[PDB]
Amino acid sequence: SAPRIMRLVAECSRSGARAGELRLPHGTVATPVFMPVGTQATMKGITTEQLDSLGCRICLGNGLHGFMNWPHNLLTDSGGFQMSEVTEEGVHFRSPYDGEETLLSPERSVEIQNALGSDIIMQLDHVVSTGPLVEEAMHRSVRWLDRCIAAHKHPDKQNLFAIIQGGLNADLRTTCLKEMTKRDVPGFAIGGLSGGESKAQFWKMVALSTSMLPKDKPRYLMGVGYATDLVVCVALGCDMFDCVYPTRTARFGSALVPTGNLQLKKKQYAKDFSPINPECPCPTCQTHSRAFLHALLHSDNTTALHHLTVHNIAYQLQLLSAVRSSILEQRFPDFVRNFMRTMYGDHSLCPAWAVEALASVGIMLT
Amino acid sequence: ESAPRIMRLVAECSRSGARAGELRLPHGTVATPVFMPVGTQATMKGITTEQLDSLGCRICLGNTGLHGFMNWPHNLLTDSGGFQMSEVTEEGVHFRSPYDGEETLLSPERSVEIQNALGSDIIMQLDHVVSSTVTGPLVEEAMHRSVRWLDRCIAAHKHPDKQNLFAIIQGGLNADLRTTCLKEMTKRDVPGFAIGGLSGGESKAQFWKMVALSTSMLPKDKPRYLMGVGYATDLVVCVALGCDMFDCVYPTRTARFGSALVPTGNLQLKKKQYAKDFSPINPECPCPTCQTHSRAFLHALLHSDNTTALHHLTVHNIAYQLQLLSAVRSSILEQRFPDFVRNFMRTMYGDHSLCPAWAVEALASVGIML
Numbered sequence A: 001s002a003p004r005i006m007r008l009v010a011e012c013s014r015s016g017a018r019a020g021e022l023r024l025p026h027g028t029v030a031t032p033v034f035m036p037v038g039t040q041a042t043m044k045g046i047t048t049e050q051l052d053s054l055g056c057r058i059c060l061g062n063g064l065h066g067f068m069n070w071p072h073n074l075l076t077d078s079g080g081f082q083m084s085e086v087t088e089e090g091v092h093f094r095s096p097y098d099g100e101e102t103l104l105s106p107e108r109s110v111e112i113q114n115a116l117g118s119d120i121i122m123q124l125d126h127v128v129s130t131g132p133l134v135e136e137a138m139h140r141s142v143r144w145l146d147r148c149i150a151a152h153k154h155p156d157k158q159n160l161f162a163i164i165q166g167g168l169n170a171d172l173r174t175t176c177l178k179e180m181t182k183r184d185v186p187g188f189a190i191g192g193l194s195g196g197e198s199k200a201q202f203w204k205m206v207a208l209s210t211s212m213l214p215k216d217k218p219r220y221l222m223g224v225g226y227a228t229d230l231v232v233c234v235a236l237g238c239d240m241f242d243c244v245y246p247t248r249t250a251r252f253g254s255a256l257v258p259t260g261n262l263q264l265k266k267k268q269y270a271k272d273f274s275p276i277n278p279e280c281p282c283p284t285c286q287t288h289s290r291a292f293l294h295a296l297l298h299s300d301n302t303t304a305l306h307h308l309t310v311h312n313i314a315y316q317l318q319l320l321s322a323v324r325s326s327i328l329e330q331r332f333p334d335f336v337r338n339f340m341r342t343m344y345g346d347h348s349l350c351p352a353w354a355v356e357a358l359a360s361v362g363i364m365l366t
Numbered sequence B: 001e002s003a004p005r006i007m008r009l010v011a012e013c014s015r016s017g018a019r020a021g022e023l024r025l026p027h028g029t030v031a032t033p034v035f036m037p038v039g040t041q042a043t044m045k046g047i048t049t050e051q052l053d054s055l056g057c058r059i060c061l062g063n064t065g066l067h068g069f070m071n072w073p074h075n076l077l078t079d080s081g082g083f084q085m086s087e088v089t090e091e092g093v094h095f096r097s098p099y100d101g102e103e104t105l106l107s108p109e110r111s112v113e114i115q116n117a118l119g120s121d122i123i124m125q126l127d128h129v130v131s132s133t134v135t136g137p138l139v140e141e142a143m144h145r146s147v148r149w150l151d152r153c154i155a156a157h158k159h160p161d162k163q164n165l166f167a168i169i170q171g172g173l174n175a176d177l178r179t180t181c182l183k184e185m186t187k188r189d190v191p192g193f194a195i196g197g198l199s200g201g202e203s204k205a206q207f208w209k210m211v212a213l214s215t216s217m218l219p220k221d222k223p224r225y226l227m228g229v230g231y232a233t234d235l236v237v238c239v240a241l242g243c244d245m246f247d248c249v250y251p252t253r254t255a256r257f258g259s260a261l262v263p264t265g266n267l268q269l270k271k272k273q274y275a276k277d278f279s280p281i282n283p284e285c286p287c288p289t290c291q292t293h294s295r296a297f298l299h300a301l302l303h304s305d306n307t308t309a310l311h312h313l314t315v316h317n318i319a320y321q322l323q324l325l326s327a328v329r330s331s332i333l334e335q336r337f338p339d340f341v342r343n344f345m346r347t348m349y350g351d352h353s354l355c356p357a358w359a360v361e362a363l364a365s366v367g368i369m370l
C-alpha cells in the first residue's frame, strides 16, 4: 500500500460524515472542503490575498502556482469536458488558434498536468451527452485511467484521481465502482451528478458511490454547490466539492444566506442599510450594505459582481468549516437539524429528497 | 504671477490645432494626446497592473494611498466624487449615506481632503452639475456655483507641488453660458483644465462646436482634458480641435456587448459568422488577446463563459485605445497629421460620402479636407 494523503480525524457515529485533512505538497487542507474555481474568481478581480484571507487553502485551476501567484494547493481537471469526436486514441477537436485537427490523449492530458505542477490531477475520461454507447464510454474511461496511471511519472509530487462514471444508471456505476477500485490511486472523484433534475436519483447515486469507495481515501464530488446538497452529501460520506455556484449566484445579483439567497436586485433592498449578513466576517459585509449593493447592481454591475462573489465564496468556506466543527464536536445530527430548520422552516417544508437521504444515514428531522 | 507649467509642447500641426506633448507628473512623464482607461473597471474584470503596464499605459483613472491600493507605479487621475453620489446647496452635495444611511455632506473642502489622502497626481475640482433636462436660469446658477467651488478647492488644496488640481468648464451645450464659464475660470491659475458636460450627447453637431469653443479660450500652454469621450472618430476629431487628454468607459462597455474594437469599427463577435473564424481579432494588434485567442474561441466563450470573454475583450479594447492615440501622436511628430486623418476616415467609413457629416464639417473647420 502506498502512503495515504488523507488522515481521518473524526467520524459521525450515526451517519457517514467524515472530518479529516489532506497532506498535499503545498500544505494541509481541512476536509470536508469546498474548492472555488480560481479563474472564475480571478476574472472578477478577486486576488490571491483576498482568497487567502478567507481561509481558502485549495482551489481549481484551468507553473500554474507562479502564474496565479498562489502559495497553496491547486486541483486541475483533464480538460476533456471543456474542449468534436471521441475515439479510443483520445478526444479529437479543432484547435482554438491554428484551427487544425488536434488530439488530447490520456498521455497528453497527464503530460499537460505534470507541467502545470498542481497538487491533485484528474484522469481523462470519456463523457457522452442514451443508448448502448454510454456503457462503452464507461469501459473506455477505465482503460483511459490505466493509461493515465502509466503516463504519470511523479506519484510523490502529484496525486492522480480517478473519476467514477455511470451517470444515473445504478448497474453501470456499480460496474465502474468495482473496476476502478482495483487501481491504487490516491483518491477518487464522483462524476456525472452535476445539475441533474431528479434530486431523488441524485442522492441515491451519491450513496451508491460512497458505499463502495475506499474509506481511507478522499471522495471528491464534482459540480455540487447548493447548500443543502453539501450538507446531505457530507452525511453520505463525501469529502471534497467544487462548483461555480457561488460565482453563478453572484452573476444574478444574489447573496448566499442561511435562509437561501437574497435577490438584491429587488426594490425591497433599496433602503435596507444593513449588511448581507451581520454575522458574516467577510470584507463585503464590513464595507457594503444591501442598499449599496442594490444600487451598484443597477449602474455599476461589474463592481457589484466582485463584492457579491467575495461574500458568496466566503459563505461556502464558512458553511463547511461549521460542518467540520460539528463533526469534531460529535454533534453533526444536531447541526443538520438546525441547518434544515433555518433553511426551510420546519420538517414539513423540507424537500422530500433530503429528508429521505438524511434518514438513510439515521439523521431524523421528525 | 504664473506657476511652473506641467505640459511641454513638443510639436504642432501646421494646418489644425493638434498638439503633441508630454506631462511632467510625480510618477513619471506621460505622452500626450493620451486616453486614460478607468482603472477600477479594469481591475474588476481581472486586468492586473502588470498587464496594463505592458500595454504602455502610464496614467489611468481612480475611483475616489491609492497607488498602493492598486499596486500601480505610474500616474493616477481621480475625480471629485460628485457625479456618483439628493439635494445641492452652497455648502456642498447633500445625500443619504450608503453605510449608515444617514444624511451626509460632500463639500469642496472635503473632496480635496479625500483626494489629498488618495495621493493621485491629478485631482478634479468639485462642481455642481445639473441634468440636461434642466433648462431655465437654474443652469446658470450652477455654473457660477462651480466657479465659487473652484476657488474653495484651490484654497483647500495646500500641496500644488505634489498634486495637480484641474478646473472643469461648465455650460453644457449653451454657447453663451460656456463662454462665461471659460472667461471666468481662465483667470484662476490651475495647472490644467477639463471640459465637462459633453459626454454621451445626442447632437454630434453641437458637440464638436462646443469642443472648439472651449479650446479657443483655454490656455495654449496648459492641458485640455475632455471627459467622457472614447469613440474612435470622436478622439481623432477632438485631437484636431486641440484636446490633449481623454477618458471613457467605452472600451470596457464595448466588451460587455461582445464587441472588439477594430480599425473598421467593431466586430460583433456574438454573431454566428465568427463561430468558425480562426484568425485573431486584428492580425496587426500586438495585444495578448490577439496572440492567444481567435475570433472563434472568443465567440464560443461569449455564449458559455461570458466572464472570461469580457476579460480578454477588455484587454484588447484598452490596447486599441492606446494604439490609436500613439499613432495619432506619432503622425503629429512626423508632421503628417492631416494624412493620418484621411487614411483613418477612409478605413473607418469607406469614402467621403459615407463619413458622418458632423465629422467632415469639424475637420474642415481646422483645415483637414477629405
Ligand SMILES: [Zn+2]
Binding pocket: A276, A277, A280, A281, A282, A283, A284, A285, A311, A314
Ligand atoms: Zn459576507
Ligand SMILES: [Zn+2]
Binding pocket: B281, B282, B285, B286, B287, B288, B289, B290, B316, B319
Ligand atoms: Zn488585440
